[PDB]
Tab-separated table of C-alpha atoms in Angstrom:
chain	number	residue	atom	x	y	z
S	26	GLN	CA	142.576	9.024	33.632
S	27	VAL	CA	141.045	11.165	30.915
S	28	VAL	CA	137.498	10.190	29.961
S	29	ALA	CA	135.506	11.614	27.060
S	30	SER	CA	132.089	9.938	27.395
S	31	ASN	CA	129.537	9.024	30.056
S	32	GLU	CA	130.335	5.312	29.759
S	33	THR	CA	134.104	5.687	30.156
S	34	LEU	CA	133.421	8.090	33.022
S	35	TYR	CA	131.275	5.442	34.756
S	36	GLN	CA	133.929	2.791	34.203
S	37	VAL	CA	136.940	4.773	35.459
S	38	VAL	CA	135.073	5.938	38.560
S	39	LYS	CA	134.329	2.297	39.332
S	40	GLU	CA	138.061	1.452	39.235
S	41	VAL	CA	139.621	4.634	40.690
S	42	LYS	CA	141.786	4.257	43.811
S	43	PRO	CA	142.543	6.644	46.684
S	44	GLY	CA	144.601	9.579	45.429
S	45	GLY	CA	143.198	9.000	41.961
S	46	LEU	CA	142.535	11.741	39.433
S	47	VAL	CA	139.731	11.488	36.857
S	48	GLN	CA	139.758	14.270	34.273
S	49	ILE	CA	136.786	14.822	32.015
S	50	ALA	CA	137.673	15.793	28.439
S	51	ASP	CA	136.105	18.938	26.966
S	52	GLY	CA	132.540	18.268	25.934
S	53	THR	CA	128.920	17.820	26.864
S	54	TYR	CA	127.896	14.914	29.069
S	55	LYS	CA	124.180	14.553	28.513
S	56	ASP	CA	121.929	12.528	30.816
S	57	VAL	CA	125.013	11.699	32.870
S	58	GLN	CA	124.336	9.540	35.943
S	59	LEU	CA	127.567	9.881	37.923
S	60	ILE	CA	127.445	7.557	40.934
S	61	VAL	CA	130.686	7.558	42.949
S	62	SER	CA	130.717	4.682	45.437
S	63	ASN	CA	134.445	4.184	46.011
S	64	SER	CA	136.275	6.132	48.684
S	65	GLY	CA	139.469	8.099	48.733
S	66	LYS	CA	141.406	8.311	52.001
S	67	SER	CA	142.457	11.132	54.316
S	68	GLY	CA	145.220	12.918	52.409
S	69	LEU	CA	144.416	10.797	49.371
S	70	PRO	CA	141.015	11.942	48.086
S	71	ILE	CA	139.683	10.895	44.694
S	72	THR	CA	139.406	13.938	42.432
S	73	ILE	CA	136.914	14.070	39.571
S	74	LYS	CA	137.278	17.284	37.605
S	75	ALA	CA	137.016	18.803	34.155
S	76	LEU	CA	140.372	18.715	32.366
S	77	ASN	CA	139.562	22.318	31.430
S	78	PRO	CA	136.980	23.827	33.805
S	79	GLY	CA	134.519	25.856	31.765
S	80	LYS	CA	134.445	23.363	28.904
S	81	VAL	CA	132.691	20.436	30.577
S	82	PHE	CA	128.928	20.461	30.929
S	83	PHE	CA	126.657	18.026	32.711
S	84	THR	CA	123.260	18.304	31.042
S	85	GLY	CA	119.941	16.639	30.370
S	86	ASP	CA	118.311	14.125	32.695
S	87	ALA	CA	121.395	14.129	34.898
S	88	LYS	CA	122.274	13.280	38.480
S	89	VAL	CA	125.356	13.028	40.702
S	90	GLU	CA	125.659	10.925	43.864
S	91	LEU	CA	128.787	11.075	46.020
S	92	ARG	CA	128.312	7.988	48.174
S	93	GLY	CA	131.874	7.143	49.204
S	94	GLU	CA	134.128	9.342	51.360
S	95	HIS	CA	137.067	11.644	50.594
S	96	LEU	CA	135.793	12.591	47.156
S	97	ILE	CA	136.100	15.862	45.248
S	98	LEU	CA	133.969	17.105	42.343
S	99	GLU	CA	135.520	20.165	40.686
S	100	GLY	CA	134.994	22.528	37.761
S	101	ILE	CA	131.684	21.259	36.386
S	102	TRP	CA	129.010	23.409	34.734
S	103	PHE	CA	125.438	22.122	35.126
S	104	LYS	CA	123.024	23.565	32.531
S	105	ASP	CA	120.383	22.606	29.950
S	106	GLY	CA	118.817	20.061	32.285
S	107	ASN	CA	115.839	17.794	31.705
S	108	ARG	CA	115.105	15.689	34.814
S	109	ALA	CA	111.553	14.304	34.971
S	110	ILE	CA	109.264	16.643	36.887
S	111	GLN	CA	107.244	13.691	38.151
S	112	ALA	CA	110.353	11.991	39.548
S	113	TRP	CA	111.906	14.658	41.792
S	114	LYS	CA	110.609	16.416	44.917
S	115	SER	CA	111.476	19.203	47.343
S	116	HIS	CA	112.943	17.592	50.507
S	117	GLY	CA	114.476	14.872	48.353
S	118	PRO	CA	118.096	14.429	47.196
S	119	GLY	CA	119.630	17.316	45.270
S	120	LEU	CA	120.886	17.350	41.678
S	121	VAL	CA	124.156	16.550	43.372
S	122	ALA	CA	123.487	14.452	46.457
S	123	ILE	CA	126.274	13.857	48.944
S	124	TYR	CA	125.684	10.671	50.948
S	125	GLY	CA	129.212	10.224	52.276
S	126	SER	CA	131.349	12.222	54.706
S	127	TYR	CA	134.517	14.214	53.991
S	128	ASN	CA	133.393	15.161	50.499
S	129	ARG	CA	133.913	18.413	48.643
S	130	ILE	CA	132.238	20.057	45.658
S	131	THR	CA	134.143	23.115	44.459
S	132	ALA	CA	134.330	25.542	41.555
S	133	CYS	CA	131.108	24.279	39.967
S	134	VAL	CA	128.376	26.221	38.185
S	135	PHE	CA	124.630	25.579	38.547
S	136	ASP	CA	122.637	27.842	36.226
S	137	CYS	CA	118.844	27.485	35.844
S	138	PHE	CA	119.342	23.739	35.459
S	139	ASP	CA	115.829	22.493	34.757
S	140	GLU	CA	112.213	22.273	35.920
S	141	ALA	CA	112.432	19.367	38.378
S	142	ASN	CA	111.882	20.446	41.990
S	143	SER	CA	114.801	19.711	44.309
S	144	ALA	CA	117.843	21.445	45.735
S	145	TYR	CA	120.922	21.787	43.525
S	146	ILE	CA	123.167	20.264	46.199
S	147	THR	CA	122.219	18.302	49.328
S	148	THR	CA	123.898	16.176	51.968
S	149	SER	CA	121.551	13.228	52.327
S	150	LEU	CA	121.028	10.354	54.730
S	151	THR	CA	121.497	6.855	53.343
S	152	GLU	CA	118.537	4.483	53.670
S	153	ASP	CA	120.022	3.025	56.868
S	154	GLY	CA	120.190	6.385	58.644
S	155	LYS	CA	123.853	7.388	58.427
S	156	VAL	CA	124.464	11.160	58.410
S	157	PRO	CA	127.158	12.760	56.194
S	158	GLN	CA	129.677	14.914	58.065
S	159	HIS	CA	132.659	17.173	57.370
S	160	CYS	CA	131.711	18.069	53.805
S	161	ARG	CA	132.464	21.333	52.029
S	162	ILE	CA	130.706	23.204	49.235
S	163	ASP	CA	132.817	26.123	48.049
S	164	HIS	CA	133.382	28.558	45.202
S	165	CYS	CA	130.210	27.377	43.483
S	166	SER	CA	127.788	29.645	41.634
S	167	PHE	CA	124.012	29.131	41.933
S	168	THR	CA	121.964	31.301	39.561
S	169	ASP	CA	118.473	31.647	38.101
S	170	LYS	CA	117.061	28.650	39.996
S	171	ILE	CA	113.451	28.363	38.842
S	172	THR	CA	112.449	25.327	40.918
S	173	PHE	CA	111.113	24.791	44.437
S	174	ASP	CA	113.145	23.778	47.517
S	175	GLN	CA	116.402	25.397	48.670
S	176	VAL	CA	119.531	25.796	46.572
S	177	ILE	CA	121.373	23.754	49.229
S	178	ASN	CA	119.972	21.455	51.967
S	179	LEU	CA	122.248	20.137	54.737
S	180	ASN	CA	120.337	17.214	56.277
S	181	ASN	CA	120.903	15.351	59.526
S	182	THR	CA	117.362	14.012	59.896
S	183	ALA	CA	114.629	12.700	57.631
S	184	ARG	CA	111.489	14.796	57.343
S	185	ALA	CA	108.771	13.667	59.804
S	186	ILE	CA	105.713	15.281	61.490
S	187	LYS	CA	108.112	15.297	64.389
S	188	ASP	CA	109.005	16.458	67.853
S	189	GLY	CA	110.218	13.355	69.629
S	190	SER	CA	112.877	14.939	71.914
S	191	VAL	CA	115.358	13.142	69.651
S	192	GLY	CA	117.503	15.315	67.382
S	193	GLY	CA	119.868	14.975	64.444
S	194	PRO	CA	123.668	14.713	65.001
S	195	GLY	CA	126.133	17.570	64.407
S	196	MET	CA	127.294	17.805	60.776
S	197	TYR	CA	130.384	20.035	60.749
S	198	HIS	CA	129.980	21.029	57.097
S	199	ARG	CA	131.205	24.256	55.571
S	200	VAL	CA	129.670	26.364	52.831
S	201	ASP	CA	131.963	29.176	51.739
S	202	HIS	CA	132.757	31.494	48.850
S	203	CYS	CA	129.562	30.638	46.986
S	204	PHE	CA	127.357	32.952	44.938
S	205	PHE	CA	123.563	32.894	45.240
S	206	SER	CA	121.147	34.907	43.095
S	207	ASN	CA	117.738	33.447	42.301
S	208	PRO	CA	114.225	34.734	41.354
S	209	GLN	CA	111.304	34.989	43.766
S	210	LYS	CA	108.919	32.056	44.141
S	211	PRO	CA	105.472	32.218	45.833
S	212	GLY	CA	105.073	31.293	49.508
S	213	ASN	CA	107.361	28.951	51.447
S	214	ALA	CA	109.017	27.743	48.250
S	215	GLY	CA	112.532	27.012	49.495
S	216	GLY	CA	115.252	29.617	49.854
S	217	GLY	CA	119.020	29.626	49.672
S	218	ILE	CA	120.247	27.241	52.336
S	219	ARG	CA	118.575	25.034	54.954
S	220	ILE	CA	120.504	23.321	57.735
S	221	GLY	CA	118.648	20.728	59.785
S	222	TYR	CA	114.890	20.557	60.363
S	223	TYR	CA	113.933	20.946	64.050
S	224	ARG	CA	115.140	22.697	67.201
S	225	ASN	CA	116.550	19.496	68.707
S	226	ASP	CA	118.856	19.007	65.717
S	227	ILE	CA	122.541	19.922	66.135
S	228	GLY	CA	124.268	21.570	63.199
S	229	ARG	CA	127.704	22.986	64.013
S	230	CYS	CA	128.059	23.991	60.380
S	231	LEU	CA	130.107	26.975	59.230
S	232	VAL	CA	128.649	29.247	56.561
S	233	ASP	CA	131.146	31.965	55.749
S	234	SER	CA	132.245	34.348	53.023
S	235	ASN	CA	129.297	33.758	50.751
S	236	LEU	CA	127.750	36.396	48.545
S	237	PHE	CA	123.975	36.448	48.317
S	238	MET	CA	123.059	39.008	45.660
S	239	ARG	CA	119.339	39.257	45.015
S	240	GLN	CA	118.858	35.843	46.601
S	241	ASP	CA	115.094	36.268	46.395
S	242	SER	CA	113.815	32.667	46.204
S	243	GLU	CA	111.517	33.213	49.187
S	244	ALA	CA	111.100	34.959	52.538
S	245	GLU	CA	114.041	32.993	53.932
S	246	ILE	CA	117.540	33.629	52.535
S	247	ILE	CA	118.814	30.960	54.895
S	248	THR	CA	116.535	28.960	57.145
S	249	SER	CA	118.892	27.678	59.814
S	250	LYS	CA	116.984	24.862	61.503
S	251	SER	CA	119.597	23.401	63.839
S	252	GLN	CA	121.697	24.361	66.840
S	253	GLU	CA	125.145	25.917	66.983
S	254	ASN	CA	125.610	26.917	63.362
S	255	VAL	CA	127.953	29.830	62.689
S	256	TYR	CA	127.374	32.444	60.006
S	257	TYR	CA	130.471	34.582	59.559
S	258	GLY	CA	131.499	37.179	57.011
S	259	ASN	CA	128.610	36.666	54.605
S	260	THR	CA	127.335	39.447	52.372
S	261	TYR	CA	123.640	39.800	51.600
S	262	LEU	CA	123.169	42.401	48.877
S	263	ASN	CA	119.657	43.460	47.875
S	264	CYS	CA	118.041	40.204	49.010
S	265	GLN	CA	114.253	39.987	49.321
S	266	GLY	CA	114.284	37.967	52.506
S	267	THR	CA	116.038	37.575	55.825
S	268	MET	CA	118.783	35.321	57.173
S	269	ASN	CA	117.034	33.274	59.857
S	270	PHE	CA	117.681	31.318	63.037
S	271	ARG	CA	114.421	29.463	62.311
S	272	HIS	CA	114.690	26.453	64.654
S	273	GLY	CA	117.316	25.575	67.234
S	274	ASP	CA	118.883	27.585	70.028
S	275	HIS	CA	122.443	28.840	70.464
S	276	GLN	CA	123.203	30.026	66.941
S	277	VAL	CA	125.869	32.522	65.865
S	278	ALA	CA	125.911	35.358	63.323
S	279	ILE	CA	129.084	37.460	63.308
S	280	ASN	CA	130.318	40.215	61.015
S	281	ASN	CA	127.796	39.731	58.224
S	282	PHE	CA	126.786	42.577	55.923
S	283	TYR	CA	123.125	43.155	55.156
S	284	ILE	CA	123.030	45.803	52.431
S	285	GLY	CA	120.144	47.207	50.412
S	286	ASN	CA	121.336	49.946	48.062
S	287	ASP	CA	118.399	50.720	45.777
S	288	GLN	CA	114.623	51.163	45.969
S	289	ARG	CA	113.596	48.212	43.791
S	290	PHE	CA	112.339	45.880	46.548
S	291	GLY	CA	112.178	45.464	50.312
S	292	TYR	CA	115.389	43.864	51.617
S	293	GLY	CA	116.606	42.180	54.804
S	294	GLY	CA	117.540	41.378	57.407
S	295	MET	CA	117.583	38.691	60.085
S	296	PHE	CA	114.484	37.115	61.652
S	297	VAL	CA	115.325	35.349	64.900
S	298	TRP	CA	113.447	32.574	66.706
S	299	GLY	CA	114.780	30.907	69.858
S	300	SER	CA	117.290	31.716	72.584
S	301	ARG	CA	120.961	31.774	73.624
S	302	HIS	CA	122.082	33.232	70.288
S	303	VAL	CA	125.091	35.451	69.587
S	304	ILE	CA	124.315	38.209	67.082
S	305	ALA	CA	127.341	40.478	66.838
S	306	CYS	CA	129.362	42.826	64.646
S	307	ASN	CA	126.787	42.639	61.855
S	308	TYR	CA	126.300	45.638	59.595
S	309	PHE	CA	122.786	46.575	58.453
S	310	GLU	CA	122.190	49.337	55.904
S	311	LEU	CA	118.858	48.787	54.168
S	312	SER	CA	117.464	51.395	51.766
S	313	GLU	CA	114.081	49.608	51.901
S	314	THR	CA	112.784	46.975	54.335
S	315	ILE	CA	110.219	44.188	54.007
S	316	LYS	CA	106.648	45.346	54.612
S	317	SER	CA	105.132	41.867	55.020
S	318	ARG	CA	107.483	41.156	57.920
S	319	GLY	CA	107.270	44.496	59.740
S	320	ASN	CA	109.826	46.794	58.066
S	321	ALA	CA	112.962	46.152	60.134
S	322	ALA	CA	116.606	45.096	59.951
S	323	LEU	CA	116.559	42.678	62.892
S	324	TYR	CA	113.286	40.927	63.766
S	325	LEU	CA	112.954	39.287	67.200
S	326	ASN	CA	110.214	36.655	67.186
S	327	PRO	CA	107.350	36.875	69.715
S	328	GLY	CA	105.707	33.547	70.611
S	329	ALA	CA	105.778	30.455	72.828
S	330	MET	CA	109.045	29.275	74.348
S	331	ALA	CA	110.748	26.413	72.489
S	332	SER	CA	107.777	26.027	70.130
S	333	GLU	CA	107.317	25.785	66.343
S	334	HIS	CA	107.691	29.587	66.429
S	335	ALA	CA	110.082	29.737	69.352
S	336	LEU	CA	110.116	32.867	71.478
S	337	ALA	CA	113.286	34.885	70.951
S	338	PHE	CA	114.820	35.625	74.345
S	339	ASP	CA	118.006	35.390	76.410
S	340	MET	CA	120.607	36.249	73.759
S	341	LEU	CA	123.508	38.597	73.068
S	342	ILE	CA	123.109	41.404	70.538
S	343	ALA	CA	126.463	43.191	70.482
S	344	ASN	CA	128.593	45.584	68.445
S	345	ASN	CA	126.166	45.613	65.524
S	346	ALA	CA	125.713	48.713	63.395
S	347	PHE	CA	122.384	49.876	61.996
S	348	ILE	CA	123.172	52.600	59.481
S	349	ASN	CA	120.374	54.428	57.681
S	350	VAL	CA	117.950	51.539	57.820
S	351	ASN	CA	114.667	52.548	56.207
S	352	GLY	CA	112.664	50.749	58.862
S	353	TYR	CA	113.139	49.863	62.523
S	354	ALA	CA	116.663	48.882	63.502
S	355	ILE	CA	115.122	46.279	65.826
S	356	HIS	CA	111.480	45.138	65.916
S	357	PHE	CA	110.669	43.482	69.255
S	358	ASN	CA	107.336	41.923	68.284
S	359	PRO	CA	107.039	41.272	64.533
S	360	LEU	CA	103.968	39.328	63.347
S	361	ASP	CA	102.601	39.350	66.902
S	362	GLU	CA	98.941	39.105	65.881
S	363	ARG	CA	99.612	35.901	63.938
S	364	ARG	CA	101.842	34.495	66.658
S	365	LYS	CA	99.178	35.127	69.332
S	366	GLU	CA	96.579	33.310	67.266
S	367	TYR	CA	99.031	30.469	66.605
S	368	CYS	CA	99.662	30.024	70.337
S	369	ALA	CA	95.953	30.189	71.155
S	370	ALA	CA	95.144	27.540	68.541
S	371	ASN	CA	97.867	25.274	69.950
S	372	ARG	CA	97.233	25.989	73.634
S	373	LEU	CA	100.712	27.492	73.901
S	374	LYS	CA	101.705	30.436	76.120
S	375	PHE	CA	102.305	33.611	74.111
S	376	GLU	CA	105.271	35.664	75.350
S	377	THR	CA	107.417	38.481	73.987
S	378	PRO	CA	111.190	39.086	73.618
S	379	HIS	CA	112.985	39.654	76.929
S	380	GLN	CA	116.290	38.910	78.691
S	381	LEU	CA	118.045	40.452	75.710
S	382	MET	CA	121.570	41.757	76.264
S	383	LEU	CA	122.101	44.700	73.919
S	384	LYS	CA	125.707	45.868	74.237
S	385	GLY	CA	127.778	48.339	72.229
S	386	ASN	CA	125.409	48.602	69.270
S	387	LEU	CA	125.410	51.652	66.994
S	388	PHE	CA	122.134	53.023	65.675
S	389	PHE	CA	122.515	55.892	63.229
S	390	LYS	CA	120.309	57.690	60.727
S	391	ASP	CA	120.623	60.897	58.697
S	392	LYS	CA	118.364	60.176	55.738
S	393	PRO	CA	114.674	61.291	55.506
S	394	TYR	CA	113.316	57.870	56.541
S	395	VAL	CA	110.380	57.938	58.962
S	396	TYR	CA	110.987	55.016	61.320
S	397	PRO	CA	112.179	55.405	64.913
S	398	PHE	CA	114.965	52.958	65.801
S	399	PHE	CA	112.786	50.531	67.757
S	400	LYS	CA	109.308	49.055	68.003
S	401	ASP	CA	108.242	47.245	71.171
S	402	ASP	CA	104.495	47.233	71.736
S	403	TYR	CA	105.080	45.156	74.878
S	404	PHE	CA	107.844	47.184	76.507
S	405	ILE	CA	108.483	46.402	80.173
S	406	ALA	CA	111.141	48.236	82.187
S	407	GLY	CA	114.183	46.116	82.945
S	408	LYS	CA	113.106	43.112	80.883
S	409	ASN	CA	116.176	43.754	78.722
S	410	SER	CA	119.610	45.202	79.439
S	411	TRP	CA	121.147	48.025	77.388
S	412	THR	CA	124.822	48.914	77.821
S	413	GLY	CA	127.284	50.969	75.776
S	414	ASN	CA	125.005	51.555	72.791
S	415	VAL	CA	124.820	54.819	70.840
S	416	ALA	CA	121.773	56.157	69.016
S	417	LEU	CA	121.199	59.357	67.051
S	418	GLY	CA	119.340	60.672	64.025
S	419	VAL	CA	115.785	59.780	65.004
S	420	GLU	CA	113.662	59.012	68.054
S	421	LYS	CA	114.256	55.646	69.681
S	422	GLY	CA	110.598	54.673	69.891
S	423	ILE	CA	110.919	53.086	73.336
S	424	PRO	CA	111.688	54.526	76.808
S	425	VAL	CA	115.374	53.592	76.990
S	426	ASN	CA	118.194	55.934	78.047
S	427	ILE	CA	120.891	55.666	75.328
S	428	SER	CA	124.002	57.756	74.678
S	429	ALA	CA	123.742	60.039	71.659
S	430	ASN	CA	127.515	60.561	71.672
S	431	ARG	CA	128.807	59.179	68.362
S	432	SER	CA	132.399	60.365	68.827
S	433	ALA	CA	132.489	58.268	71.991
S	434	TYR	CA	131.117	55.139	70.330
S	435	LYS	CA	133.299	52.075	70.841
S	436	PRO	CA	132.529	48.392	70.286
S	437	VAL	CA	132.514	46.393	73.532
S	438	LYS	CA	134.888	43.666	74.690
S	439	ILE	CA	133.195	40.282	75.075
S	440	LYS	CA	135.132	37.354	76.530
S	441	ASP	CA	132.678	34.864	78.047
S	442	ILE	CA	131.446	33.363	74.777
S	443	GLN	CA	132.287	29.680	74.466
S	444	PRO	CA	133.481	28.635	70.999
S	445	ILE	CA	131.437	26.080	69.066
S	446	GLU	CA	132.994	22.626	69.088
S	447	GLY	CA	134.228	21.678	65.641
S	448	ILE	CA	134.433	25.254	64.382
S	449	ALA	CA	137.858	26.903	64.484
S	450	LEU	CA	136.756	30.459	65.269
S	451	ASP	CA	137.595	32.589	68.302
S	452	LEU	CA	134.161	34.076	68.966
S	453	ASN	CA	135.283	36.321	71.830
S	454	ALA	CA	138.110	37.794	69.762
S	455	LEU	CA	135.972	38.294	66.659
S	456	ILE	CA	133.156	40.007	68.549
S	457	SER	CA	135.586	42.238	70.467
S	458	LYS	CA	137.281	43.601	67.340
S	459	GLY	CA	134.005	45.076	66.155
S	460	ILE	CA	132.984	45.105	62.490
S	461	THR	CA	135.822	44.297	60.076
S	462	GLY	CA	136.239	44.368	56.314
S	463	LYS	CA	133.356	45.181	53.995
S	464	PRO	CA	130.860	43.613	51.547
S	465	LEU	CA	132.258	40.781	49.402
S	466	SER	CA	132.297	41.072	45.614
S	467	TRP	CA	131.971	38.612	42.738
S	468	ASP	CA	135.729	38.324	42.199
S	469	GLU	CA	136.225	37.297	45.817
S	470	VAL	CA	133.988	34.219	45.513
S	471	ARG	CA	133.789	33.158	41.853
S	472	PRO	CA	135.176	29.831	40.556
S	473	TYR	CA	138.848	30.431	39.693
S	474	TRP	CA	138.191	29.571	36.040
S	475	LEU	CA	135.006	31.629	35.682
S	476	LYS	CA	135.259	35.288	34.745
S	477	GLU	CA	131.669	36.350	34.131
S	478	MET	CA	128.603	35.994	36.332
S	479	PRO	CA	126.196	33.323	34.957
S	480	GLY	CA	122.475	34.084	34.716
S	481	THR	CA	120.713	37.435	34.522
S	482	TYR	CA	118.741	37.849	37.740
S	483	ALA	CA	121.539	39.268	39.888
S	484	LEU	CA	122.321	42.241	37.630
S	485	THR	CA	118.889	42.852	36.077
S	486	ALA	CA	116.259	41.374	38.441
S	487	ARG	CA	114.808	39.813	35.276
S	488	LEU	CA	114.873	36.384	33.663
S	489	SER	CA	115.269	35.844	29.913
S	490	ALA	CA	112.116	35.118	27.925
S	491	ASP	CA	112.890	31.400	27.764
S	492	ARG	CA	113.725	31.106	31.461
S	493	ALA	CA	110.805	33.281	32.538
S	494	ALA	CA	108.481	30.941	30.626
S	495	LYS	CA	109.806	27.807	32.312
S	496	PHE	CA	109.631	29.522	35.705
S	497	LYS	CA	105.939	30.352	35.234
S	498	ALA	CA	105.234	26.770	34.190
S	499	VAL	CA	106.955	25.434	37.324
S	500	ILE	CA	104.978	27.778	39.562
S	501	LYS	CA	101.712	27.052	37.763
S	502	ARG	CA	101.783	23.248	38.060
S	503	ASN	CA	102.520	23.583	41.780
S	504	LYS	CA	99.380	25.671	42.390
S	505	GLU	CA	95.675	24.744	42.558
S	506	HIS	CA	94.309	23.507	39.220
């Protein structure tokens, strides 16, 4: 039914049956506490949506909890928030917390909600330990987030000092067609998306067709902290950070576009920890790279095997293109001084990237940038294998024999890559085709009912006076007194 107030909303949701449809009348729902405990059924989900998306706003000291299964939240605009700053925390449930499996949140807008630290959307474990699975977050816009923690957290474990060989279960969630553009916070303040927490956690989540435009929250655009996650067809435009395989081996990044097209900031990028990854058909064209990280497009982490800063080794880097990157195409030992010290302080064995299979990659440069294609201060003959790559425009930087014949460049056929269980993608076929399509635009991801881009950071790299003030206050109270 049609509800026009928080109370009637609460009541109808408490009575709604599988296949039900709850439509929220045009208006503002202030301090709304939407708790959905009932469940829809496969093929008969319960849909809660604005009667007219774009005219329903959830505001104030609000909160949404999707606890049942087979639920759908659609066409809601979250703004003018006021949650208590002393009641919410990073690593806690998000503004919208999904505790049940098979749930979907689509065509919703989150725009500089409030000052309470937390993610905007999270999948959270119930107090008894159950892990949500098969959820989808799509066609949602996340802009001008001025609070700590990621925009989205996909959890399969509770935060703990850790490292008991145990690991979290596979989630099988999907995040697609979303828009992320948020201002830069100091330090490890939470980025765009986090999946899992430690290397023993299994993710098997699909993140595809998302547009990150000036997603500058922190150093990490995406901090993938679980095994077997697949990142496909995502566009990262002028983002001050890198898309990372932070914890967990065997991760996949295929046909993503990393583009930096101005000189305003340093952009990225992918920083890779761990082994057995598949990094293929990605396109890197960065006008400026990140100085603090080593000025590169692809960073391969030096360190101790399977540690907190897992050595990056034994992986496939194929059919990628590094076009006019103003920095190294590939840095083989970024942050090595810090990593060495870290290993020494933890009695770990410091090692450097090796057993890398670099096949059919294109490295090209014709602009007046000064960086050779590669940096490997620990180069050892034969530690890595190079086959079918092409490089021209600048010195390579390392003693490797590579074809300079561009007209003969051809992506390589790969056919021994096992697909990830639960994810319907033919990895061998996708890699073999080479790089397809091009960067995604706003119209290709925006909520069907939304015409204009919310917020101001994406197009101006600036926050309004009111939002800039709140942002400083948030940052200030989180720093030493």
